[PDB]
Design a protein around this ligand. Sequence first.
Ligand SMILES: Cc1ncc(Cn2c(C)c(CCOP(=O)(O)OP(=O)(O)O)sc2=O)c(N)n1
Ligand SMILES: Cc1ncc(Cn2c(C)c(CCOP(=O)(O)OP(=O)(O)O)sc2=O)c(N)n1
Ligand SMILES: Cc1ncc(Cn2c(C)c(CCOP(=O)(O)OP(=O)(O)O)sc2=O)c(N)n1
Ligand SMILES: [Ca+2]
Ligand SMILES: [Ca+2]
Ligand SMILES: [Ca+2]
Ligand SMILES: [Ca+2]
Ligand SMILES: [Ca+2]
Ligand SMILES: [Ca+2]
Ligand code: NA
Ligand code: NA
Lengths: 525, 525, 525
Amino acid sequence: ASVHGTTYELLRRQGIDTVFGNPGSNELPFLKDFPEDFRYILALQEACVVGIADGYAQASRKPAFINLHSAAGTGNAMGALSNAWNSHSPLIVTAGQQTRAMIGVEALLTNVDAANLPRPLVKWSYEPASAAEVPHAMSRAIHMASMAPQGPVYLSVPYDDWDKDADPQSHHLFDRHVSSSVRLNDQDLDILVKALNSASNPAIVLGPDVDAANANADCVMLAERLKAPVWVAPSAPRCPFPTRHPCFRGLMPAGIAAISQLLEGHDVVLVIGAPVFRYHQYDPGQYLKPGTRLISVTCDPLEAARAPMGDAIVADIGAMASALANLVEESSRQLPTAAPEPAKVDQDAGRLHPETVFDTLNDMAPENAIYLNESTSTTAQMWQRLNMRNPGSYYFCAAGGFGFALPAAIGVQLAEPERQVIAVIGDGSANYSISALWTAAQYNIPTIFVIMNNGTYGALRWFAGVLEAENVPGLDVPGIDFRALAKGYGVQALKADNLEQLKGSLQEALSAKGPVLIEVSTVSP
Amino acid sequence: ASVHGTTYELLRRQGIDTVFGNPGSNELPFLKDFPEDFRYILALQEACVVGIADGYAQASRKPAFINLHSAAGTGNAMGALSNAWNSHSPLIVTAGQQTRAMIGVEALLTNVDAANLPRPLVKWSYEPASAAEVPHAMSRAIHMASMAPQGPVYLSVPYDDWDKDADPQSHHLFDRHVSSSVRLNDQDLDILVKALNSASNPAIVLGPDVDAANANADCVMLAERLKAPVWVAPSAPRCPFPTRHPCFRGLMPAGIAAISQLLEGHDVVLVIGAPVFRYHQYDPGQYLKPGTRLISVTCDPLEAARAPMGDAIVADIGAMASALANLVEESSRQLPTAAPEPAKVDQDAGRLHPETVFDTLNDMAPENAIYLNESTSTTAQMWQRLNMRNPGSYYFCAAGGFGFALPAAIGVQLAEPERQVIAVIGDGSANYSISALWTAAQYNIPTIFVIMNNGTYGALRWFAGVLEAENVPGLDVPGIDFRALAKGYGVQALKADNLEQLKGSLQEALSAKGPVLIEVSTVSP
Amino acid sequence: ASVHGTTYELLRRQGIDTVFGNPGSNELPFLKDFPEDFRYILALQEACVVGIADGYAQASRKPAFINLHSAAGTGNAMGALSNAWNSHSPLIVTAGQQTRAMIGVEALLTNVDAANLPRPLVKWSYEPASAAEVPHAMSRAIHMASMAPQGPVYLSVPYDDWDKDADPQSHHLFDRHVSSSVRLNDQDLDILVKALNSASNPAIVLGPDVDAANANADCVMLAERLKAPVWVAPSAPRCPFPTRHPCFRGLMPAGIAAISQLLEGHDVVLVIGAPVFRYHQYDPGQYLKPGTRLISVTCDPLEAARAPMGDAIVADIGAMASALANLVEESSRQLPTAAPEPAKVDQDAGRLHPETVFDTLNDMAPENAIYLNESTSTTAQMWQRLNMRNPGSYYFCAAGGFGFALPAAIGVQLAEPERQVIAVIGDGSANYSISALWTAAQYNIPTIFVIMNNGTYGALRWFAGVLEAENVPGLDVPGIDFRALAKGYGVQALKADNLEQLKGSLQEALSAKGPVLIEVSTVSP
Ligand SMILES: Cc1ncc(Cn2c(C)c(CCOP(=O)(O)OP(=O)(O)O)sc2=O)c(N)n1
Ligand SMILES: Cc1ncc(Cn2c(C)c(CCOP(=O)(O)OP(=O)(O)O)sc2=O)c(N)n1
Ligand SMILES: Cc1ncc(Cn2c(C)c(CCOP(=O)(O)OP(=O)(O)O)sc2=O)c(N)n1
Ligand SMILES: [Ca+2]
Ligand SMILES: [Ca+2]
Ligand SMILES: [Ca+2]
Ligand SMILES: [Ca+2]
Ligand SMILES: [Ca+2]
Ligand SMILES: [Ca+2]
Ligand code: NA
Ligand code: NA
C-alpha cells in the first residue's frame, strides 16, 4: 500500500470522513484519488476553513479534519486556532510541505520550522522524519486531538511522501481505541459527594466542557438533587444548561469582585467543565469571600494549575457529571425558583433595540434552534432572552477572536441538519470571515445570518467610555452593504429596518430552502 | 512622562507617523489620546491590516507600524507575515496584551506565551518585563525591523503599561541612528571587480532586494558596463530592472534544471539581492553546468548559508550595487539586443485571454503605473507584456501566500499617491482579503483592482494536469459576483465581458476619483 | 558517494580537521571509518567537550566542530553554549539522532523536537528532512557559525543517514566561500572619520570582537592617532588591547552610573566590538552624562538594537578597525600617559593574597602567556597586574557561566601550542568541569591550572554583604583536595600554601612537559 492509501484507511477507520480545506500545490498529492466515501468542504480563506471545521467538531462532538496550504495557509488560520484552543476543539490540522528534496534550499512554499508555526495554540505539532512515518504521525494527531483535554493539533507532510510505500505494520494503527473517560477514585469521590450532601447553601457553575461532553442533562439532575442555583462560567463559549430551568441564574459577570460577591453566602461552589475563571474586565477584589470554598472539576491540567483558589479534580466531565448526579442525596431544601421573564423594552417604528431582536428570535425560532453570538455588546441581553432548552444550542468565540461565528455557524448547521442555526453577528465582526458565506451557498447549508448593524465597534466605544479615553481612532465602520456582500457570495439577502420588516424577514428566512442573511438596522450606542 | 507619551515621541523621532490597525480592548490604552500628528488606517481584518502596511513599507522603503489585538488578531495576520518574512518587509507588529494583573489567571484576551506565537516568521519577538521597559523594547523593534536584512518583528504590550511613568533615561532612545549600509572591504571588492572585468560571458540575476534598495539604476549601469544579460530571480516579489531595457531577459523559470540550462555558457553569474534560488516546481538536475560559476551578493546571512552553490558576500544591496556599477570596466563586447515584442494573441469578441488583458493594460496605463500580481496562472504573460520602466513597479506575494495583493495595493497606493496602482488578481485570490476593499473606499485610496475571473483555481487545475492527478476536489470557485462584493464595501464596480468592455472599463477607471474594481471574464484553462 | 564520505569531504574542504566529542550509539555511524586526516579529541562530559572546542575556536579564530550524543549529551552542554552565544564563538554542534524508522515511537535516545532543545542559545538549529540533505544542512551550519556575528549552531542527524547515497550535486557545496568582511560605505565612513577628527576629548571602548577579529593592532594605531584613552568594555570575555600601552585605562566597571561618570567630559566615545554595555550590578543613573555622545561599531544587529543610547554601525570589526585606523588624522594632542604600576600588597608567610599571586604570575610567566579567568572575586586585580602585550591573551566566560575556563584552557593550549596557557580558577569554579583535566592528561596538552582555594564562593559572600543579606545557605565549599582530583585524572599536582611554595610550584610547572595543577591557599574574604 501507499502512504496515501494507508492514511485514508486510518482516517476512515477512526471515523473521519470529511476534509475541510483550501487547497494548494503541496496538497495535490494528498487530495488526488480522493476517496469516494469522503466529503471535501471548500472554503475560500483558511480562517473560514478552520472556523467551519470547528463548529462542525464542537456540534458533532468528534474530531474534524482540516487540510491547509503550507505556512501561508496555516498562518491565515492562526486566529481561528486561538479560539479552538480555548474551546478544547478536537481539530486535526494538516498542512502540505514542499517535497523533501527542496526543503533545504527553502523553495517557494517551504514551511520553514513548520512545527513551531502554530505554537503555542496547539496540543501537539509535528513533521515526520520520513514518508513511512506519516500514518503513525497521523494516528498520533488523531489521538492527541481527541484525548481529554481535547484541542487542535498540527501535522506537516512533505508532498512527496504520499506516493511512497507504507510500512505494512501500519495496519496496527487502524482500530486503536484510546480512552480518557475517567473519574475520581471511589474513596475520594465519596469524600466529594459527602461534602456536597453536607453543604448548607451549595452553588454550581458550569462551563463549556459540560456541553462538549453532553453532560447537560446530568448537571440538571445534579442541580435538582442539590437544590442548587446554576450559573454559567464567564466568557462562555457554549451553553451547558437549559436557560429556563428553575435553577438557572444566567451568565456570570467576567470580573473577580463581581463573582466573589455573587457567590457570597454559598458555602460550597462546585465548578464543572470551566476554567476558574475566564475573567475579562479589570475588577479587582477578593477571589472568594470568607465562608465560600470552591471545588473545580476540569478536564484540563492547565486549568487546574492556574486556578487562583479552590481544590481541583482533573477528570472527564461526562464521567464525573454522571457519577455525581447519580450519587448525591436528594436535599430536602426547596428547589430554586425560576428567574422572572425579561421585560419588554420600549420599541418605536425605527431602528431595532437588540432586546427586540432577541425577543423576536425567541418568539419565532424553533425550540431546537442553535444560536451563535458574535455581537458582544449584546451578549447579556442574548443570554437573558433566548430560551435554549437543549444541549448544543449556543456558541461564542472562546478566545474572543472574531471571525468565528460566521464560518462556525455553517459547520454547526452541517453537523445538525435538522436544527435551524441562527448566527447573530455584529456589523464589525461580520467582515473578519465574510467569505465563508460562499461555502453555505455552494453546499446549500441553510444557516441564517442575522447582522446587527449599528455602524460601529460598539463594545469598544463603550469600553472607551469606561476608560474615559478620548480621541481613540478606528471605532466606526460605516458604509458596508451586507445585502450586497451576501449577493456577492450567492446567499439570499433581506433587510430589516424596523420591527415589521424584522418579523417579515425572519418569516421568509425560516421558510427558505438555503442560507439567508438578514441585515438588521440596530440602535447606535 | 508616561510610557504612552515617551513611546509616541520615540516613534515620531524615528520617522513613524502612521498606525495600521484593527483595534481591541487591550489596545485602547495605547490608542487613546492618539497624537494629532499621526494617521490611523483601519482595516476590517488583520490579514488586511498587515497587507496594507506591507505594501506601504515596501513602496516607501521605510518601516511600517502595525497595531493588532492580542493572540487572535496576531493569528489572523500570520499568513500576511509569511509573505513579509520572504520580502524582507520592515514591519513593526505590536499587539496588546492583558493587564499584568490577570495574565497569570489567563483572563480572556491574554496572549499566552505571546512571543512564540508569530515565530518562526519574525526576526525578533518580545514581551517586556515591566512597563518602563516598553520604550526601550519599541526601540529594539524599530531597529530590528530596519537593519539589513529587513523583516517583520513583534512586540506584545500589557495594556496597563501605557499609563505608567517612563524612565527619564529613555530620551537617549529618541535620536539613535543605526546603519547597516555596508560593502565588501576594498581588497576583496577589487578581487570581485577584476573577476567581473575578466569574465568572457557574464550574466546578472537580480532579486527583490535590489528594488527594495532602489539599486535598480545602479544595476542598469552595471549591466551596461559589463554588456551582460539580466534576468529576474525566480518567484520574483518585486521588479528590479526596466523590462524593456536591451539587457533584460525576463523572469527565470523556478526550476533547478531550467536555470542551469539558461545559464549554460555564462562563465560568471552575478546574483544580486536574491536567494539562490527561490525554486518552486520539481525540476531536478544540475545546479550549474560545467563552466559556470556563481557569485551572490545578499543582504541576508540565511540566504548566503543555504545557497547550494557559488560564493557569497553578505552586505547592503544599495552600497554594493553602487560600488560595483562605478568600479567595473566598460567592456568592449556588444550590448545585448532587446527582446522582441510579444505577439498579439488571437482574440474574438468573447471572454478575454490574459494576454489581451495585459496588452490593453500596457496600452492604457500611465508609464509610471505600479502593478501587483495575484493571478499566478498568468504570471509569465504579465512579465512579458507590461513595460515597467521605473523602480517600485511590481509586487507579488513573496511567500506565495494569497491575500497579499488586494490589501498591499492599497498600501502601495497610499505610499505613491501620484502613481496609479493596478492590482491584477485572480477570482480565487480575490477572496482571501476581500474586506480590504473597505479601506480603499473609506480613505479614498484610488487603487484599481482588476479581477481575472475564470471561475476556477486555474494554476491548481494545471498542476493537477502535470501530476496526472485525477479526482482532486475543491478546484472550482463558481458563483462569485465581484461587482456586488465591491458594492458591499463601497467601491465603484465595472464588468468587462469582452475587449470592448475592457477598454471602456479601463478608461472609466483611469479617470475615476476613487478606487475601482473591474471584473474581467477571462478564458477558462 | 555516501552521505558520510560527502560530509567529511565538505568538512575538510571548509578547513575543519578536528572533532571534539563524547560519543554515543547514534554517533557511531558518523564516527566509523573516521578519516585518517582528522583528529578526535575526547572529553568525559559534554560541558567539557564544548568548552574545549570553544577555547580552540576563540584562539584559532576559526570554527570548531563538535559531536554530541542526542538530547542528553546536547543538554549537558547547554551551559557551555550560553557562554559561546555571548562570545560569538563559531561552534558547529552536531548531535546524533535515532534512526528515522524509530523516531516516531520515541525509542530510547530519540531527541524529541530536537531543533528546539538548544534554543535560544544558537544562531541556527536544524534537523534535515532526508539523508541526502545532510551535506547541504552541514554546509548551512558551517556558514551560519562562521558569518558575522559568529556563534554556535546545531544540527541533529538521524544515524541511518550516513550510509545512504549522497546527491552528486552536493559537490557544489565543497568550495563555497562566504564573506561578511564588510565596512561602512565611503560617504558615511567619511562622516564618521571627520567626527572622530573633530572630537576635543575622544575616548575608545573595546570589546571581545576586537580580539576575535585580531583588530587589536589596528585599535592601537587608532588610539595613538586620536590620542585617546582606551577602556575594555565591562564583563570582558577577551582582552582587546595591550594592557601596558600608554592609552590603556583598564576594565570598565559593569554599572550604568559608574560608566557614565567615567565617560564624563569625553565628547565622543567610540565603542568597537562590544555590546553597549554588558552591565552586571545594579547601579542606576544616567546612561551618558550631558556632553557625551556615543558611536558603536558592532558585528551584531542584536547589540545595535538593544543599546540604550548612541548611534551604531553594524559591520565587520576587522574591516572597520583597519579602515578607521588608516583614515583618521594624527591629533596634535598629547598622548595619554601610562597608568602607574600597581602597588605591592603586604604579604606575610601565610595564605596568599590574590594580588601576590597575580604579581608572581606576571613576574614568572612568558611574555606570550595566555590567561583564563574563572576566579571572579579577583578579576579587578587580575586585570591590573598581568601585562598582556599580545592578542589572544585573556578569556573569561562570556555569559558568566562557570565551567568554561578549565576546559577552554585546554582548547586554547591546543590552538596555541607555543604559548603557555595559565588558567586561574576559583575553588568553587574548578568543580563545574573538573573532568576536563583528563583530556589534558591524555593528549598531553600542557595547560597550567592555578586553583585559587579559599574554601568559599567568595563573590557571593561579598554580594550577600552588599545586600545586607543574612542567612544565605550554600556559600561555602570546604573539603576539596584539588591535588587528589588532579591525580584522579592523571595531571601532575602541586600545592602552594605560601609565597615560597607558590614560586617553587610555578617554576616546576613552567618547566614541566605536561599539564600541571597548582592548588594555592588564598586568603578568605
Ligand atoms: C480578530 C479580532 N480582532 C479585533 C477584535 C476586537 N474587538 C472588536 C473589533 C469589537 C467591536 C465589534 O463590533 P461589532 O459590530 O461586531 O459588535 P458590537 O457593535 O456589538 O461591539 S469588540 C472587540 O473585542 C476581536 N475581538 N477579534
Ligand atoms: C493563502 C493561500 N491559500 C492557498 C493557496 C494555494 N493556491 C491557490 C488556491 C491557487 C489558485 C488561485 O486561483 P486564482 O483564481 O486566484 O488564479 P488562477 O486561476 O490564475 O490560478 S494557486 C495556489 O498556490 C495559496 N497560494 N495561498
Ligand atoms: C554555572 C554557574 N553556576 C553558578 C554560578 C554562580 N556563581 C558562583 C557559584 C560564584 C562563586 C564562585 O566561587 P569561586 O571559588 O570559583 O571564586 P570566588 O571565591 O573568587 O568567588 S560567583 C557566581 O556568579 C555561575 N556563575 N555559573
Ligand atoms: Ca416572547
Ligand atoms: Ca456594531
Ligand atoms: Ca501595445
Ligand atoms: Ca481563477
Ligand atoms: Ca613585578
Ligand atoms: Ca573561592
Ligand atoms: Na508560532
Ligand atoms: Na531549549
